[PDB]
Symmetry: D2
Subunit: 312 residues, 4 copies
């Protein structure tokens, strides 16, 4: 009967998790629960309190708490998973998946136990295999376990194109399938400035350089920082997906989604175009791909399946 | 002739500076220049790039660059100074001022040389003496050199009251003069919920406890974090002041401002109520204080003047 | 299971109703249903379509439909009533209440039948008696039938004070009990600029003139327009109340609420300070009034009760 | 030296002009001056006052005045022209241009006299010929005299497509050249859902029906209303263009711009893709058109030139 706010729990209180929590609160999307391990309870509480203390300045009405008790996550509408070790250049997907999947087992069980009807959005890398690991543990329908990947890659692409052309980011679009790095399958033919195909505005070699920059983009930020990794753009990407869900917007966005026949593939998570709304994955949209795009995507599938073999 | 964006430079690329840069960009208030020392050029660039790469997601049109070259700060409308060592419990104001004022001399000279008509907003602690140090080096009129203090303290107070009463932060107000900690002179008689005096809504001892929490509030966040300090609420406070200036809003806010007779004091910076707009300090508003408030403020003045003696 | 948007129906597609619908949609607060009589179905649809066609420009995701079929209002979270004849100078409350209460009977029944758990917010004048008429027909708990009055009066007051002092509207507050016009009981002692009492900033006669302007403020707009009445500020006031409810903000705001002992009165609606949130009226806040304020409020009560005698 | 707000004057205080003024103020883009003839001074003031009185509710800091004295428009950054008779079905372009161009002569002279460096955005129909009439009277460079057309047409298209597909309006794009109605040259090949070509998602006949609906869209709203015309979506379209200019965003948008060789045409205004920023028209973007598109655009040019012959 009482009209109540949405609730989001953000798992992992490192910079991407904390930043996601703040951005959600700032937009008055939900009350936020920022979660981390018991040994880090006080820093988690400190982050959440600092965020809360910003709220009267900017004027946003949100509760934000820090916790190590999954009871506090009960009946979350969305749970965003940012826990685990960050991807770095020179780390193999296989080592990272072994590390992160071991951490995540107990986490997924605790999430699902307290919010049986949550939609889970996974940041943790390598996200194609990690989203699968979460899906297998959670006991949820596939539509409710999704990963983040292409929003961030398209954000970086759009930034690079916007700076190349000196144009508003509002009017640039990018399009990617697959995953990050060598797994990314960009469709520059579906990438525009104000709807105008980018191939007509930027010469081939420059556009190739921008695509390569996009492939390497997370590593670029890691290299500049010296220690740490990106978190503003990853957080913003998580929040855009979370907002689509909480507000049932039926956005068309790239997401890491479970395939059972789509694009000819089955039984893995892969970056694909989806309609995102209040049910989670509303639809996977199947494009007519050109031969080269389809070969690239086949390679991305094989790569993801190789990383999956590591899971126990 | 070309209509151009405002420009803000943020000095110091630690968490409060970076966060301020992001929040300004996010609000499309200005193009942002994030500055730090040459030895940290790549991390500064990495922070700025990550922020920029968030912009297509959220849709904000801002340039954000990282630099170590004060040439890039030229003709800034506002310069926000966040550089220096953070305040911590057990650090004396005298030691911190010696440290931070030595760092700041060359910084202020570089700011003023490149943006002779800037308004400078100072975060660096101890802010009453540090704002004075910046004022003496810059060669600017007093109205254009201001410090941040009471916005953050009132933000924390409002958060505590909002949680005590379970009421919107939008409707709680606080009122403080002086500075932080033992220097704070709160006026609970000018603190309300929806205009209703808080003394009528909360018993004396609880209200006293909340005032004491406000006095200790930065240390509270330092203690929970274990390493580091607050940055979301300090950043939000800087941005509110910056916005008032850039948009000539003539907000009524507590600020650290130079006194030449106001409240009976001269030749120091002190936290006082001001009208903040496109000239910087538009007016210092002189209240009729009660005897106890005036004694407290006299003590705060003596404390600030004692810290000033350290400056060389 | 599907996370779904809130739903608001706005009854009456004149300028205040249409404007409320647009502002709600613009803020992505809800899907909106704009309702009017069957004979005006096409204009209602035309208004709603024009609003909907604005949505891609500004980027807001809202459904907005026009209708004459109360089936389309089913399961509304909030229903905002703007139907009826507008108040004008020289119209007596007694004539207006007879007119508007006859119109409203069938409307309230239709609302309650289709959304038994709605919170109703009433604009229609004379709002103290009209909210009562809606309350008696609806079969809802008092907390879920509320009227708008003091938000608009305080908005006008704040505008006048802001212009007098040349200060941000963000920092001015006003405080009123009762209703409009001669029924308004302002508390200038609870009215501030940045928390500073306005009696200390503006001389008595000027402040009296601004209070009188507030009393007459709706008529002022009627007189300037020549035909029609205010709708931007009334719409904004409705939306602020609606937002408080939909987002469970627990705002402290003046509202027209049913009294059963509060302030010593019973069995009428009266403008009083409330906490507004997801249950509707969360609490009526009882102030300690001065003798003159209490006499004024007694007169306002007698005036409202005299208008109530007209209801059949 | 004082940092000051931007200033926009909106000429014509009918519903599209008033609505534009409100939306600009609401976004804190500028101080607004709403202008109309001396005989309508009081209603213009009444509209502006009602808007201003909304500002404390929503919290926006803007001055909004109503006037009949072009002195009050002095040094406007942008002037938006909404004055004149609205287009209706069955009104010929030739009659409307004779009517509206006679009204506008004195208006343009008064604008240019008081704001010699303004950018003028023209709504008044028939906009291709009316923008030309304003350009010839104003004495301004072509880049600073522009008309609105394609933003509104693309907004309606995007609304129709969004409803057809049940997808976020944020992710639909449309693309039009020329002008309204029979003059519109849509490029459905440059129209997408999340970058996916709409021709792959909607069958030909449905897409044709949606294009025809777009051609007729202003008349549709006129027919539903019975009296009056659209104003929410036209206002939103004006504000998007104004925002691009005031914030130097370099948006890629359709606009009515003066051609001196672009697309092979000279010496008329025509709807074309532009980069819009702080100089006005930053660039006209020349597409490679297909034979059918180019024939359609040639017909649109001939139609505009025929209406131009009416101008004296």
């Amino acid at each position: 009967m009482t009209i109540k706010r949405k609730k989001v729990s953000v798992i992992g209180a490192g910079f991407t998790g904390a930043t996601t929590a703040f951005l959600l609160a700032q937009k008055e999307l939900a009350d936020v629960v920022l979660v981390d391990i018991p040994q880090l309870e006080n820093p988690t509480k400190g982050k959440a309190l600092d965020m809360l203390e910003a709220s009267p300045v900017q004027g946003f009405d949100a509760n934000i708490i820090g916790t190590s008790d999954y009871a506090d996550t009960a009946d979350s509408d969305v749970v965003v998973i940012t826990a685990g070790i960050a991807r770095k250049p020179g780390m193999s997907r296989d080592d990272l998946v072994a590390t992160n999947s071991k951490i995540m087992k107990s986490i997924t069980r605790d999430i699902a136990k307290h919010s049986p009807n949550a939609i889970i959005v996974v940041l943790t890398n390598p996200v194609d295999a990690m989203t699968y690991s979460v899906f297998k543990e959670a006991g949820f329908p596939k539509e409710r376990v999704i990963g983040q990947s292409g929003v961030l890659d398209t954000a970086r692409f759009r930034t690079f194109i916007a700076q190349e052309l000196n144009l508003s980011v509002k009017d640039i679009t990018g399009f990617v399938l697959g995953g990050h790095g060598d797994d990314m399958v960009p469709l520059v033919r579906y990438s525009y400035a104000g709807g105008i195909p980018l191939e007509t505005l930027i010469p081939k070699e420059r556009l190739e350089a921008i695509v390569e920059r996009t492939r390497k983009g997370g590593g670029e930020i890691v290299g500049l920082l010296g220690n740490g990794s990106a978190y503003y753009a990853p957080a913003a990407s998580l929040v855009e997906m979370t907002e689509a869900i909480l507000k049932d917007q039926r956005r068309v966005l790239p997401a890491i989604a479970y395939l059972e026949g789509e694009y000819g593939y089955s039984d893995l998570y892969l970056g694909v175009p989806v309609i995102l709304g209040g049910n989670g994955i509303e639809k996977i949209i199947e494009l007519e791909l050109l031969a080269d795009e389809k070969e690239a995507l086949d390679r991305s599938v094989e790569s993801v399946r190789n990383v999956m073999k590591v899971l126990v």
